[PDB]
Amino acid sequence: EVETFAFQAEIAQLMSLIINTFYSNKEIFLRELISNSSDALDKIRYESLTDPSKLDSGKELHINLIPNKQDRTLTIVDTGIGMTKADLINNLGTIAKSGTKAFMEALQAGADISMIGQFGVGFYSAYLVAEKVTVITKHNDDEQYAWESSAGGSFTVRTDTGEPMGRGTKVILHLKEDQTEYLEERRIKEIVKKHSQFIGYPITLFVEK
Template sequence: MQKGKIGVTTENIFPIIKKFLYSDHEIFLRELISNAVDATTKLKALSSMGEFGGELGDLTIRVELDEKGKKLTVSDRGVGMTEEEVNKYINQIAFSGAEEFMKKYENQSGIIGHFGLGFYSAFMVASKVEVITKSYREGSQAVKWACDGTPDFTLEPTDKAERGTDIVLYLAEDSAEFGEKTRIEALLKKYCSFLPVPIAFGKEQKWEDGKYVATDKDNIINDTHPLWMRKPTEITEDQYAEFYRKLYPMADEPLFHIHLNVDYPFNLTGILYFPKIKN
């Protein structure tokens, strides 16, 4: 087992992360899912270039919640990481000190986008985080990284049959809200509804004998092929209207819409709806 200290220059970096990394702590889930999508997309790209010859298999990202144990897990079957990569991408946070950090980012919203800190947003809501990962590279040894919110971490070999990464969050007492199924499902729908990789949260429910029971079918919370990615000639007016009602169920019907497909000077696809103005 390897033991060490994460590469920071202050013992106080984790309290700063917890309080000031993002103004809304709920963002942590968006960040972790985005990382999982990136890892999956990268594997698909490697496969298309012939640099990964294995079977892609089921690439669904899975979010699991243990409500009783207050434990949240985000799992992907993407590229995964080797021990060397964990040391490179997780254990080295290049901050020049808490004082300079605070001075430079007095406006909290200015932090977003300045660092690759998506993973560390987990510590805003978790008292302990584990990363269990195995690289897509043939013959790779799976490793487990664990940290309890201090610069101390452990990194050791572990058993993991499939490639990819599991991030396990042990939720802190002051973040108990994220241990509720309804809260997590709402956040997934809020931030992840149109991500390009399927995201499963539990199983679909059906009404049976006077109660809801779980089926064997994954509860996929996102639409990987949203309406704006399809050709306008394939879409009916009713489908445009239905999509708008799904996004804005309490709004009036829009005046009209424009289906955008721009390729210069940048690529942009989308549907621009014009709502009715009452005043």
């Protein structure tokens, strides 16, 4: 059972901007996703200080980067606080409203796309390299859900039937045909060292066999 929702007008405008403009410095998407994962891990770790039972769904706090040349996907996995159904559908997009408007004002005040993180909307930089993004997420207070969008103004949310995650979020990037360099080991390493050398959680690169 799948529900289809329309993106808020300003978010749909940002994604169409991100997809259609010519911007060569596409590697910043990984920094933004890793920084988002760091925030999610900070939140569960902070909450667990007053409630250790919040870690019953997993004590490990880490980030895994998993390229797959066969499927042409790059997957970013964190064991952070995860996302509820209301987060996926309403609350997060409501908070991103002001940032998207301001980010688009800044895009005419000099700023470029690489500053997307300073407006709290860095996640949508995934569409610099991805034609489709799938988000599997599990929050302690909700079921496992699957969010998906190929942009174009709509996204879907459904209960996920696949492998249970425990807790956290999995961002699956279905890369565009010309963006397969982000499946390469030495390319991901160079990006992580340059942009995320100061993340307070272990970032593990899964190399393919």
